[PDB]
Amino acid sequence: SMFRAKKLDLGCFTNVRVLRDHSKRKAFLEAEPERQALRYVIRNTTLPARTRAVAQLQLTQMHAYTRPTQIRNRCILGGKSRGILRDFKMTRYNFRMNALMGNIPGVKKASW
Amino acid sequence: QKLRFKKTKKSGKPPLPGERKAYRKKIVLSNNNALPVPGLETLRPNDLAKQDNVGSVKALPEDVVDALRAMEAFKPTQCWGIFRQPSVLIRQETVDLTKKMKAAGADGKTIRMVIEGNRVTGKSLLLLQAMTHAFMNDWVVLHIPEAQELTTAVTEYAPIENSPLWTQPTYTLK
Amino acid sequence: EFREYARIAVWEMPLLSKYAKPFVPPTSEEVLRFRYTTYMGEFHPADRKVVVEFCPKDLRDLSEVQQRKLMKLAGPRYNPEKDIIKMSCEKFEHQAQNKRYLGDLIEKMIAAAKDPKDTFEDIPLDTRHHTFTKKISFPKEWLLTEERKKELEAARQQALLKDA
Amino acid sequence: SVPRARLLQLVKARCELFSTTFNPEGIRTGNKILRQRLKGPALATYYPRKNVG
Amino acid sequence: VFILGVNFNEHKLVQKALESFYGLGQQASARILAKYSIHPRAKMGTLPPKIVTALTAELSTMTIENDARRLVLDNIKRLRDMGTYRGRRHAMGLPVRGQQTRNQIANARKLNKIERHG
Amino acid sequence: KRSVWKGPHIVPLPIQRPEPGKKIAPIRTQARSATILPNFVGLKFQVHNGKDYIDLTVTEEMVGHKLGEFSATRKPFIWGK
Amino acid sequence: AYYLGLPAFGPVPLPRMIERWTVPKSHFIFKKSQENFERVTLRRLIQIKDGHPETVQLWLAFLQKHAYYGIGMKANVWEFSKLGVSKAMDESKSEVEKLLETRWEHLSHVSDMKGVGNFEDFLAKERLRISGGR
Amino acid sequence: APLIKMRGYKGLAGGGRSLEVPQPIPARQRRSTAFKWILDVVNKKPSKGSGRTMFAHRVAEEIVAVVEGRSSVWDKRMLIHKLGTANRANLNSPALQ
Amino acid sequence: GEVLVNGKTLAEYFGRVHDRESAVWALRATNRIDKYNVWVKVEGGGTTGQAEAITLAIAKALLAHEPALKPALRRAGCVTRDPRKVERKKHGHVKARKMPTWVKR
Amino acid sequence: SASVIFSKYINNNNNKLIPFKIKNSDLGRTRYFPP
Amino acid sequence: HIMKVSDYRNPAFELIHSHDLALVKLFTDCLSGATVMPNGGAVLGATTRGNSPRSASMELAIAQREAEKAGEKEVPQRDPYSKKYDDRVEAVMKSVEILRLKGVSKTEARGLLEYWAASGMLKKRVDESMVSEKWTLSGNGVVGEMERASLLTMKA
RNA sequence: AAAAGGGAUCAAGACAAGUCAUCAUGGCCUAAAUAUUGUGGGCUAUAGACGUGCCACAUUUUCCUAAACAAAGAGAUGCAAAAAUGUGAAUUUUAGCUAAUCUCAAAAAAUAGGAUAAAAAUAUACAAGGAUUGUAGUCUGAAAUUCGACUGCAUGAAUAAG
Ligand SMILES: Nc1ncnc2c1ncn2[C@@H]1O[C@H](COP(=O)(O)OP(=O)(O)OP(=O)(O)O)[C@@H](O)[C@H]1O
Ligand SMILES: [K+]
Ligand SMILES: [K+]
Ligand SMILES: [K+]
Ligand SMILES: [Mg+2]
Ligand SMILES: [Mg+2]
Ligand SMILES: [Mg+2]
Ligand SMILES: [Mg+2]
Ligand SMILES: [Mg+2]
Ligand SMILES: [Mg+2]
Ligand SMILES: [Mg+2]
Ligand SMILES: [Mg+2]
Ligand SMILES: [Mg+2]
Ligand SMILES: [Mg+2]
Ligand SMILES: [Mg+2]
Ligand SMILES: [Mg+2]
Ligand SMILES: [Mg+2]
Ligand SMILES: [Mg+2]
């Protein structure tokens, strides 16, 4: 809620969850170097035990939005998250319809 | 309570111990159906050394077949049950080896060589021709048929007192 | 558009010959062969790597044992087949920073190979990172020369007598 | 046939000549997190921002 | 012959006889034969009387059928006393390792018990 | 944490040891994945099972287990009534 | 490449790259009916041998200005050089300053640019935005 | 190899029965049916030895028992010949016309 | 009559005697095994696939020396290029033709 | 002389010579390649 | 098989070398000259290519004796970074001769084919043109392959 | 060369066939809630029963040994060599390649040998099989308890081809 931009900046298909997954990609971009220093101190077995325990506790307090595993690709035209193609940012369906019309460059119906 | 279908539940003398193993190891050194080759001569005490016999097939003596058969010289992979009389081929290597074995015992010398080759090139049956030249010339043939029976952990073994060696009693007796 | 490109190849291309320079083969001092990649007006993160490949025997300042120690330090960067040390660098943001590093890193390898402290003559050259290839060639004895034609006729004449 | 202690002297001369970590004991120094390259900037720019309408 | 009370036939591999005891497997048995220089393919009939007695004295110290089941049954009993989710499953005779219970839970109902066989 | 080499999963808890004889209320927590450390062996917890909080008294036999293993989330399936 | 004296070799047809996707024809349950898509990448290779370094850059510059729509080009340039790169790249600082004397007009900014802040950091993160993220 | 084959016509003999009629079979269909019977007898015998020649020698022993007339396939051949001889009148049956 | 397949001999490359015969069938059908030396280089395919390829290869090469053997090679089966090729997998099918179990109910 | 590396790229010359062959087969016109 | 570590285990569960077996330790001695047979004789050791593990030590030694006898200054040598060698095997195979078997000559193959034909097992006209076809299908005279192509076929 | 083959395509109409949960849209409803955010839980429950799959029930199988022959595809949101360590999952450390170059990467069946048998039903000869469970680890990730994928050790269910 605190990470949702007060002014909408999304130019693609807007959705309740599309607006929620976008707030996570920005929150992780700001805390990635900080979140990578806590995962490095936790895995560095050369540092004192207390040093690794403090980083392990602070990583647990990070907001969920900061976690990168929360990010999930969504269709920029439909807003779904099931069956998305990374190469086109679309569902398996929206890819088909656009590919046949000719909106996706290079893609052609395959026969062999 | 399960109510599915469940299939309802519902001859010859067995072979003696060691019968199956003795089947895939027996050697058939004869075939009555095969024809008796005319002109096939038998070997002599000094017939594997002459070079004029290179490229000619000669039959093994019947008394040597009783010795080569005693120390498991023949093998199942080799096909002897296709002909009537066990006969070998005097190769150009046989005369090369026999002449060395014939001169070794002449002056009490000792030759030590390792027969080498590719797959089925005659490596084993060249030992069978070296044993044949031994029996026929009053030699003492001490042959170990399979060297894998000594290392595959299939025979009894026991240690020696105050020594790192290990003996194989059951194999040494046989 | 085909006319727009024919107008360029009839009137603008000939003017490219007024600024061309002939190719001159590198001298004995040009021992390095750098490689730079371009994407023709496109930003690609791989357009910052600089590959350099030099031959140890081109450095005529190093001795026999010093040239071999330079191959042991190279590690997997040495190609025993072609006898060429190839090394890259894509650590820095710009291409100029990746070439300067390899220009200094090669001066340390040549400075470390001259160190008389340890010649590494005990270590045998390791070539387990490379996979040697086997090239088969047509047997030279099968070529039907004038001398082999006579050798074949003699063999074919010997086979007839045996059967006969 | 080459002693292991004599081989590490060559593996150590490369680390200095190339400035690489020298960990002959395989200790978990967590360096696998330092060599992993950040992917944040690539993920943030997934949804096209608001443009001229 | 007799090995720690149990009787075995002559035409039986010694390797397979030591593997019939709960807790003994390939690793343990393989190390017991080497101790007394018994080739893996040795059958029961060939063992001399002396060596047979040694095996009995060798297994008397091992953690075997009754001493090993105790440890497994104590581990399962401790889960039911504490009240863990893994404990209730054994009591209820249900899959204990996060398995879909919609179908194919026959072996679970049959074998999952506080008084396991071992 | 499954792998032992990077310690157990520890969550910030209000585990303040009281003076002897004081009455301390049970700890209400939803951290169902917190390894039961030895340092709070003997405290009274109230683990969240998704709907309610089930009381728990940590003992020496629970060290190493997760707090979520002592509070069932679903209900035992019973056919009939 | 002929007018510039660069002997070109090609066009060498490289193996075409084929990507494949099989998507259901319907946006719903009907999975028994699918169809195949693909994206074939056709490519060529023009290799220049014994070409002057600078002359090659003119050849490449001429092609980018008159690039044909719908073609992506990638070039790898090989150049020989002497030892001691550190010095060479330092002596040629003044030589490049004379060639840029008449090119500094392109860039223009207010005195003491405050929006750039850390220069080296600006380039790094501004190159990502243009590239698209990486 | 049997010289004829039996093929019935669905529902032409009586109250829900098929009219069985014998037909001749070509060479390839004659040898195939014969060798498939030999394998059937082989696959039902018990194992006798070891090695690679197990199956090969179990088939050859059946090829020798067939030339000696003491094989079980001979009873399987004559059994199909009787059906044809018994149904030799169905060729001109009134249900097929 | 010395045949070398990819550097190795006929017995070291082909372990199945069926393939050795089909590889040099052109020389065998015309009875010229002892009059030509063949040095072949094969790539791709399996054991029999490569052996059949060598057949058509030696056939064409043999015709260059003696073009009058085509009528015989025609009847020996060393001139036709078998175009049979593995069919592709089709969506909805487990294989080129095999379809999943069709549930009537 | 010449560089040892400049000589290791000249020896790699197994190029096929342009044959300038003479066509003996009749050729049909190409298709209409659309935009 | 006897040029490697055996599959036996000692009381400490440690593999016993094949040269520690009394019977195998007696042959390796006569093969290496340690045990001097007074009355002379012969110590032959035949390899096998069916069901036998590879031992770099044995193969290297054979390749070393063939080079020295052939008058070659460049003899094969150990791979300094290979750890599959055995010092014991080298000492045994250090001064042994070698016999390399290959396909029989065209002449010998004829004398071996006329015996198969005179016995009724080969129903073909045994001539030069036919002796060369079996000599070619059998990898330039390999006797074992000459048998799989003329006796163990499905044409006779 | 040739008696070629496969793919894509497959109309109108009907089944008021499916989708107002991709999207889009008319009418009708919610607007402090039928809207929005987080923590944990659930979608993984289980008496009975129905669908597709994998795999096994040893003798044309499985097991052991060895020096054969593929295609296609993947790596800028990364494929990871060679070394060293561990029984193993894997770890330590990064050479090269952003690719007909470097890497994943190794084809397997096969071919040729070898071992095992009263190979389950004569209980002192209980085969093959790998379910269930205990336990110690590894990898990803705040997080592996509900509820992950693999590895070592032990446990060793039904299963005689239906
Ligand atoms: N000189 C010969 N005379 C007759 N037959 C021979 C002769 N040499 C070999 N053979 C036959 O060749 C076949 C294989 O021979 P052999 O068994 O000796 O091979 P090998 O060298 O032992 O192969 P491996 O490497 O597998 O041990 C046998 O059928 C054998 O009879
Ligand atoms: K297929
Ligand atoms: K229609
Ligand atoms: K409807
Ligand atoms: Mg042999
Ligand atoms: Mg079911
Ligand atoms: Mg049509
Ligand atoms: Mg319907
Ligand atoms: Mg709607
Ligand atoms: Mg579900
Ligand atoms: Mg299995
Ligand atoms: Mg590796
Ligand atoms: Mg893979
Ligand atoms: Mg086999
Ligand atoms: Mg059975
Ligand atoms: Mg079992
Ligand atoms: Mg779990
Ligand atoms: Mg069935």
Using an 8 Å Cβ cutoff, are H22 and H81 in contact?
no
Look at ligand 1, atom 31, and give the residue with the nearest C-alpha. B78
Q: Which amino acid is at A40?
A: Y
CA distances from E85 to E76, E80, E88, F57 (A): 12, 8, 6, 16
- Helix, strand or coil, per DSSP, at residue B115: strand
The burial of K136, by beta-carbon neighbours within 10 Å (0-12 exposed, 13-18 middle, 19 or more buried), is given as buried
- The protein footprint on chain L, as nucleotides within 7 A of a CB, is 1-9, 18-19, 22-24, 35-53, 59-60, 64-74, 76-78, 80-85, 91-101, 103, 107-119, 124-127, 131-135, 137-149, 153-157, 159-160, 162
Using an 8 Å Cβ cutoff, are C44 and G131 in contact?
yes
A96: nearest CA partner in chain G = G23
In terms of Cα–Cα distance, which of F1, C44, C90, D36 is closest to A33? D36
Rounded to 10 degrees, the C-alpha dihedral F61/F67/F68/F70 comes to 40
In a 13 Å sphere around the CA of A37, the CA atoms on its Cβ side amount to 6
Vertex C105, ends C104 and C107: CA angle to 5°?
A: 65
- Cα–Cα distance between E23 and A62 in angstroms, integer? 47
- Cα–Cα distance between C109 and I94 in angstroms, integer? 58
Q: How many CB atoms lie within 10 A of CB D7?
A: 15
- Residues 101-160 of chain C: which lie with beta carbon within 7 Å of strand L? 126, 128-129, 131
Plot region of B72 (φ>0 → left; ψ -120 to 50 → alpha; else → beta): left
Beta bridge partners of B59: B42, B87
- Cα–Cα distance between K18 and K4 in angstroms, integer? 6
Beta bridge partners of G80: C33
The rounded Cα E84 to chain-centroid distance in angstroms is 26
Q: Is the CB of D2 under 7 A from strand L?
A: no
- Helix, strand or coil, per DSSP, at residue K6: strand
Q: Which residues, at least 6 apart from C87, have a Cβ–Cβ distance to it below 8 Å?
A: C51, C52, C53, C74, C77, C102, C105, C106
In terms of Cα–Cα distance, which of B91, B83, B98, B78 is closest to B34? B83
Residue with tokens 């001695």: K29
The burial of K116, by beta-carbon neighbours within 10 Å (0-12 exposed, 13-18 middle, 19 or more buried), is given as buried
- Cα–Cα distance between K28 and K88 in angstroms, integer? 10
Q: Which residues, at least 6 apart from C10, have a Cβ–Cβ distance to it below 8 Å?
A: none
- Cα–Cα distance between G44 and G12 in angstroms, integer? 5
- DSSP β-ladder status, G8-9 and G47-48: antiparallel
- SS3 sequence of chain C: CHHHHHCHHHHCCHHHHHCCCCCCCCCCCCCEEEEEEECCCCCCCCCCCEEEEECHHHCCCCCHHHHHHHHHHHHHHEECCCCEEEECCCCCCCHHHHHHHHHHHHHHHHHHHCCCCCCCCCCCCCCCCCCCCCCCCCCCCCCCCHHHHHHHHHHHHHHHHHHC
Using an 8 Å Cβ cutoff, are B92 and K108 in contact?
yes
Using an 8 Å Cβ cutoff, are K141 and K106 in contact?
yes
CA distances from I50 to F59, I6, I22, I42, K149 (A): 72, 11, 10, 7, 20
Partners of G22 on chain I (C-beta within 8 Å) are 91
Q: If you write DSSP's letter for every residue of E25-44 in order, what string do you get? A: -HHHHHHHHHHTT--TT-BG
Using an 8 Å Cβ cutoff, are E22 and E118 in contact?
yes
Residue with tokens 């008058």: K71
- Helix, strand or coil, per DSSP, at residue B103: helix
Q: Which two tokens stand for residue E90?
A: 């054994």
Q: Which two tokens stand for residue E68?
A: 């090993």
Q: Which two tokens stand for residue K22?
A: 């009394």
Using an 8 Å Cβ cutoff, are K55 and K4 in contact?
yes
Asked if C43 has any chain G CB less than 8 Å from its own CB, the reply is: yes
- Cα–Cα distance between K92 and K86 in angstroms, integer? 11
- Cα–Cα distance between H97 and K143 in angstroms, integer? 68
Longest dimension (CA), chain E: 57
In terms of Cα–Cα distance, which of K143, K63, K75, K155 is closest to K109? K143
Q: How many CB atoms lie within 10 A of CB A21?
A: 19
Q: How many CB atoms lie within 10 A of CB I68?
A: 7
Residue with tokens 């506080």: E114
In terms of Cα–Cα distance, which of F80, G113, K6, A51 is closest to B155? K6
Q: Which residues, at least 6 apart from E83, have a Cβ–Cβ distance to it below 8 Å?
A: F70
Using an 8 Å Cβ cutoff, are C115 and C72 in contact?
no
Among H47, H48, H64, which would you mutate to test the B interface (most chain B Cβ atoms within 10 Å of its Cβ)? H48
The rounded Cα A5 to chain-centroid distance in angstroms is 16
Please state at what angle helix K128-137 crosses helix C146-163, rounded to 10 degrees.
120
Task: Produce one character per residue of A72-91: b if its CB has 16 or more CB atoms within 10 Å, e if not.
Answer: eebbbbbbbeeebeeebbbb
Task: Produce one character per residue of J6-26: b if its CB has 16 or more CB atoms within 10 Å, e if not.
Answer: bebeeeeeeeeeeeeeeeeee
For H20, the enclosing helix (H) or strand (E) is strand H19-24
The rounded Cα A23 to chain-centroid distance in angstroms is 9
SS3 content of chain F, % helix, strand, coil (to 5): 10, 20, 70
Q: How many CB atoms lie within 10 A of CB C72?
A: 19
- Helix, strand or coil, per DSSP, at residue B112: strand
Using an 8 Å Cβ cutoff, are K102 and K139 in contact?
no
Asked if I91 has any chain G CB less than 8 Å from its own CB, the reply is: yes
- Helix, strand or coil, per DSSP, at residue G78: strand
- Cα–Cα distance between A41 and F6 in angstroms, integer? 10
The rounded Cα B3 to chain-centroid distance in angstroms is 64
Q: If you write DSSP's letter for every residue of I51-93 in order, what string do you get? A: HHHHHHHHHHHHHHH-GGGHHHHHHHT-S------PPPP-TTS
- Cα–Cα distance between F73 and E59 in angstroms, integer? 46
D4: nearest CA partner in chain C = C123
- Cα–Cα distance between A91 and A77 in angstroms, integer? 9
- DSSP β-ladder status, G17-24 and G75-81: unpaired
Q: Which two tokens stand for residue K128?
A: 């030069």
Q: Which two tokens stand for residue C22?
A: 């002939």
Q: Which two tokens stand for residue C156?
A: 């074919």
- Helix, strand or coil, per DSSP, at residue K20: helix
- Cα–Cα distance between F33 and G74 in angstroms, integer? 52
Residue with tokens 């090679």: I73
SS3 content of chain H, % helix, strand, coil (to 5): 50, 10, 35
Tell me which protein residue sits closest to nucleotide L86, measuring alpha carbon to C1': D26
- Whether chains K and I touch (3+ CB pairs under 8 A) is answered by yes
Using an 8 Å Cβ cutoff, are K57 and K85 in contact?
yes
- Cα–Cα distance between B145 and K46 in angstroms, integer? 10
Q: Which two tokens stand for residue A88?
A: 């086109």
Q: Report the distance from CA of residue I45 to the C1' of nucleotide L109 in Å, as an integer.
A: 15
- Cα–Cα distance between F36 and F13 in angstroms, integer? 12
Q: If you write DSSP's letter for every residue of K45-107 in order, what string do you get? A: EE--SSS----HHHHHHHHHHHHHHTT-SS-----TT-----HHHHHHTTS-EEEE--PPPHH
Pocket mutation for ligand 1, best pick of B31, B78, B90, B94 (most atoms within 8 Å of C-beta): B78
In terms of Cα–Cα distance, which of B37, B60, B25 is closest to B133? B60
In terms of Cα–Cα distance, which of G33, G7, G8 is closest to G22? G33
C49: nearest CA partner in chain G = G76
Distance from CA of G68 to the nearest CA of D (A): 28
- DSSP β-ladder status, K5-9 and A108-109: unpaired
**Ion ligand 5 neighbours, Cβ < 5 Å:** B 124; K 48
Q: Which amino acid is at A31?
A: A
- Cα–Cα distance between F57 and A95 in angstroms, integer? 56
- Cα–Cα distance between A53 and C140 in angstroms, integer? 74
| Subunit contact E84:F65, Cβ cutoff 8 A | yes
Q: Which residues, at least 6 apart from G98, have a Cβ–Cβ distance to it below 8 Å?
A: none
CA distances from C45 to A86, C42, D32, G122 (A): 19, 10, 22, 16
Q: Is the shortest distance between the CB of B22 and ligand 1 below 6 Å?
A: no
For B110, the enclosing helix (H) or strand (E) is strand B110-116
- Cα–Cα distance between A90 and G33 in angstroms, integer? 20
Picking from D33, D47, D50, the nearest residue to A43 by CB comes out as D33
In terms of Cα–Cα distance, which of K86, E36, K20, K24 is closest to B150? K24
For A27, the enclosing helix (H) or strand (E) is helix A18-43
Q: What is the resolution of this structure in A?
A: 3.1
Cis peptide before A48 (omega within 30 of 0): no
* Technique used: cryo-EM
In terms of Cα–Cα distance, which of E64, E85, E87 is closest to E76? E87
Task: Produce one character per residue of E11-26: b if its CB has 16 or more CB atoms within 10 Å, e if not.
Answer: eeebbebbeebebbee
Q: How many CB atoms lie within 10 A of CB K115?
A: 20
Picking from K16, K108, K111, the nearest residue to B166 by CB comes out as K16
Q: What's the K142 CA to ligand 1 centre distance in angstroms?
A: 9
Q: How many CB atoms lie within 10 A of CB G104?
A: 9
Using an 8 Å Cβ cutoff, are I35 and I1 in contact?
yes
Kindly tell me the number of DSSP H helices and DSSP E strands found in chain G.
Answer: 4, 5
- Helix, strand or coil, per DSSP, at residue B99: helix
Q: Which residues, at least 6 apart from F67, have a Cβ–Cβ distance to it below 8 Å?
A: F29, F31, F32, F33, F34, F36, F45, F47, F56
Residue with tokens 């059958």: E43
- Cα–Cα distance between C76 and C79 in angstroms, integer? 8
